[PDB]
Amino acid sequence: MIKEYRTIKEVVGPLMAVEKVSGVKYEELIEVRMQNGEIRRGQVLEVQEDKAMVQIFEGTSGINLKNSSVRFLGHPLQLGVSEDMIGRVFDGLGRPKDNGPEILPEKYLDINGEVINPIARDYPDEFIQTGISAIDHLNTLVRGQKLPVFSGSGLPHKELAAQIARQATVLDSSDDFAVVFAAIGITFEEAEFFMEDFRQTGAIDRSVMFMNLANDPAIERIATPRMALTAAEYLAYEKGMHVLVIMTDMTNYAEALREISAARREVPGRRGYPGYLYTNLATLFERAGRIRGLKGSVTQIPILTMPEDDKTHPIPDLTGYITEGQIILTRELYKSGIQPPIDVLPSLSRLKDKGTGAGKTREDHAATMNQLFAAYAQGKQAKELAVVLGESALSDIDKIYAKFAERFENEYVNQGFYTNRTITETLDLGWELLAMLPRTELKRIKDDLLDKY
């Protein structure tokens, strides 16, 4: 029957307590009929005795207690999945916002998703050519990989994401990428720019998107990323597509969970954030990879703005412990006009060793790559010495390196947000940056690879 009660106990902020109820399940989607006719959705957070504590996604603004009702739906929050979702605009809860026809759902999947069996998993060794030498050579991106982009407030993190989805492809194949985007509490100006770039590319129709802007209620931001990953795996493993996931801003997502964590009077952890943050971010990031027997795949490129530009903040720290590597944008490289301002020293990719080599990219990629970082680290170390102790004080051997790191930033990394360089042009460029140093200083490339190149 229609389970709806009218005995409200108390309303405190985004939380709400109903008494004299029965049959209420945990994580149950609810609806609040007020004294004026408005409907606001919510989820159950705790059920004890005849009481139920719920969280209102749109907030409790102007709600009379005596004359309101709570409609329990008896099921968790679901998403109407269908292939007609392609090229549609949904809000942060799932309602379409592009003023189009209603989707006829082929299925209703729980937004929480499901855990892929590690035995049923397929290890992603596929190579993705992103057109960016700092990624394709240094921190290789593979299909089915968990590789986020760390950025800060004001940094061109939105320019870099459009560049990657515009230029992403795989070697010896013609398959296209079904991009899935999710806006989490961002401003309208960032979202509109992303929309205009997607239109320009011609991939807008392929992408499925969920929109939660800054003026939207913060409580619903907890469910918006779970909307996308449910629709992403729906198109990948069930429909047989290669799905790419790009989300921003994940920083606003963590802020949304802390609001409920603070409203629920829970036991805080680091900087007031809830203790289960590593787990809660894991429910989202581990929804990626390939399954044996299915032609689909889920690749994730998260985006977060580091609060106070601090990597030891709980948001970017726990993200690194879950995701396979990261891509870090520094304000110092953007300060110098480097596009993209990718700092490749602290960045890393962990799935690339199986994605490079002969037959995948180039035979000698691994040896050049290893040789690059080591010499860049010392060249940057020498530049930081030149500016302090003087140019002449630096050793002549180090002084050759000081120029090594200068060209490796203005020419190698700095390539622009619209340059799709090939993997052959990227690795050939890398040797040209290693030909400066004498052959004796290239110790982590074998003679066989040194002689042939």
């Binding site: 203790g275 581990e286 027997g293 720290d317 890393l348 680290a377």
Partner: protein, 579 residues
């Protein structure tokens, strides 16, 4: 017969009344779905059930039934080369029944295959006084590991009837005449994961382990039966050590436990293990590896079980007399699972919110490992080596997890971010790391190759210690006024860091260094710094001796690359450096 009724559901915490017959630490089937849980506390007739599955869609009023026994595992044939979840359920069989690639709810499956037919070869004969731990027979589960079926604990009597044949794990293979009566024994025994398997005596581990890693086997060694911790930040190399240690350990069994990490890590581990063929055996590394996997997105309470499950499987194999190495990657996620429960139990949190009993549970875990005399008349020698990975936030080892860990472990493999970003691997901080076994392993290694190894290792550590003293007084001052003698030590430390410590797992050669190779490379670099000291004390300028030794100093670089058969190449560098 009691049917409990749920009165509260708060995440993975479910409270239910009418439980007065049940006891603490009892497994339960919660809800209409029947999800697996466990009683953690008990107030009046209400019991707080720690649920090991997702609790979405469960409310008050649903039935809950106890099982009468605690969380246990099936120790018998069919465990080798198999992967299971936190409660030891076979994930491959989980795929075959539900017929889906996704994890479900409300299903219970036995760990081992009870319908599989094994060849039990009886070793003991009827009429022998037997007790807990005695071996009555064996089943060759793989080519190398001889799975010996032993008398379970609590069974002490005389064997009356026993013979070889083809039976299942359930089928009775022996009848023991105990005081209580005639008891039928099976190839499978159950054992609680939160109770450690008993022994006859705890011996002291002084037999070191050959891991194949140069920084490990020389400066910070771990003995068979030791406890090593690997703290470090993300991307520092914590999982690379666990994989490479398992691939190249001389142990008889490997128990790799994935705790709250990434599911993609488990995939390549299960695929690469049957390919890593041991040339001296013909079999692979998979046939001695037992995998336990509970990923980060899986239920949080199951992370507790995964830790106690692997250490229990290691004790079933150490009772046979075989060296076992258990891998805990990572311990931090287990620690997180406790705090999240302690917050839902309104308990008093410690530093960073962790429960105060964290150091107790850690001490209760590592104290199971070590060299032990297994129960039995043969007095067989078993050992468990614990290699744990800790993931403190921001590389801050001052967290309680790492601090409580370093108070019970003996080896500390601290990983450094500054070295990992410089592509230095394995990124082990030599100054920061340590090993309480470095003294005794030095005495053993001094004897095996009959060389003063303990003091030439001390000289290498001293050189690396002298560099840190120089580098710290020289970062800001600068090296321009560096004395000629001091500059040599800098070039000695640079050779020690890039040639010996810097090693890549992916290249087939650098992955393993034998005891004969680790000496030859050390002999080249140490005799260099010792005899080139005599060169600089011959009134020589610094600039010179280097410029005229770039050819020797390069052969020193590729010293790791020399194949095991061609070691003479490495030892021949001692005479050319002198000349």
């Amino acid at each position: 017969m009691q049917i409990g009724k749920i009165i509260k559901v708060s995440g993975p915490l479910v409270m239910a009344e009418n439980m007065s017959e049940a006891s603490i630490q009892d497994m339960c089937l919660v809800g209409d779905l029947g999800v697996i849980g466990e009683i953690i506390e008990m107030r009046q007739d209400v019991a707080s059930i720690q649920v090991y599955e997702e609790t979405s869609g469960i409310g008050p009023g649903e039935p809950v039934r106890s099982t009468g026994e605690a969380l246990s595992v099936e120790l018998g044939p069919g465990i080798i080369s198999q992967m299971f979840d936190g409660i030891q359920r076979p994930l491959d069989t989980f795929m075959e029944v539900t017929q889906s690639n996704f994890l479900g709810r409300g299903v219970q499956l036995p760990a081992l295959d009870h319908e599989k037919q094994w060849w039990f070869e009886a070793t003991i004969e009827e009429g022998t006084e037997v007790s807990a731990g005695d071996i009555i027979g064996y089943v060759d589960e793989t080519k190398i590991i001889q799975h010996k079926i032993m008398v379970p604990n609590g069974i002490k009597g005389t064997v009356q009837k026993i013979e070889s044949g083809s039976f299942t794990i359930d089928d009775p293979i022996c009848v023991i005449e105990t005081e209580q009566g005639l008891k039928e024994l099976t190839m499978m025994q159950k054992w609680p994961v939160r109770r450690g398997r008993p022994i006859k005596q705890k011996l002291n581990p002084d037999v070191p382990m050959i891991t194949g890693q140069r920084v490990i086997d020389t400066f910070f060694p771990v003995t068979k039966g030791g406890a090593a911790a690997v703290p470090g930040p993300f991307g520092a190399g914590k999982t690379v050590v666990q994989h490479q240690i398992a691939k190249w350990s001389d142990v008889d069994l490997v128990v790799y436990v994935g705790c709250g990490e990434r599911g993609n890590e488990m995939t390549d581990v299960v695929n690469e293990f049957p390919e890593l063929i041991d040339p001296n055996t013909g079999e692979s590394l998979m046939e001695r590896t037992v995998l336990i996997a509970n990923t980060s997105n899986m239920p949080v309470a199951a992370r507790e079980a995964s830790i106690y499950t692997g250490i229990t499987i290691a004790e079933y194999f150490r009772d046979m007399g075989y060296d076992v190495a258990i891998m805990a990657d990572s311990t931090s996620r287990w620690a997180e699972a406790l705090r999240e429960m302690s917050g839902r139990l309104e308990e008093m949190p410690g530093d960073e919110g962790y429960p105060a009993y964290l150091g107790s549970r850690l001490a209760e875990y590592y104290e199971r490992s070590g060299r032990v005399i297994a129960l039995g008349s043969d007095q067989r020698e078993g050992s468990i080596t614990a290699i744990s990975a800790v993931s403190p936030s921001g590389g801050d080892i001052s967290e309680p997890v790492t601090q409580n860990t370093l108070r019970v472990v003996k080896v500390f493999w601290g990983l450094d971010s500054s070295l990992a970003q410089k592509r230095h691997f394995p990124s082990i901080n030599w100054i920061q790391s340590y090993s309480l076994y470095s003294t005794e392993v030095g005495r053993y290694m001094d004897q095996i190759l009959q060389q003063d190894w303990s003091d030439m290792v001390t000289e290498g550590m001293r050189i690396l210690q002298e560099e840190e003293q120089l580098n710290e007084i020289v970062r800001l001052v600068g090296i321009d006024s560096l004395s000629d003698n001091d500059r040599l030590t800098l070039e000695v430390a640079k050779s020690i860091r890039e040639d010996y410590l810097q090693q890549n797992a992916f290249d087939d050669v650098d992955t393993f260094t034998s005891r004969e190779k680790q000496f030859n490379m050390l002999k080249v670099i140490l005799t260099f710094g010792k005899e080139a000291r005599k060169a600089l004390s011959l009134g020589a300028y610094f600039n010179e001796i280097m410029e005229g030794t770039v050819a020797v100093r390069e052969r020193i670089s590729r010293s790791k690359y020399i194949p095991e058969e061609e070691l003479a190449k490495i030892s021949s560098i001692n005479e050319e450096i002198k000349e």
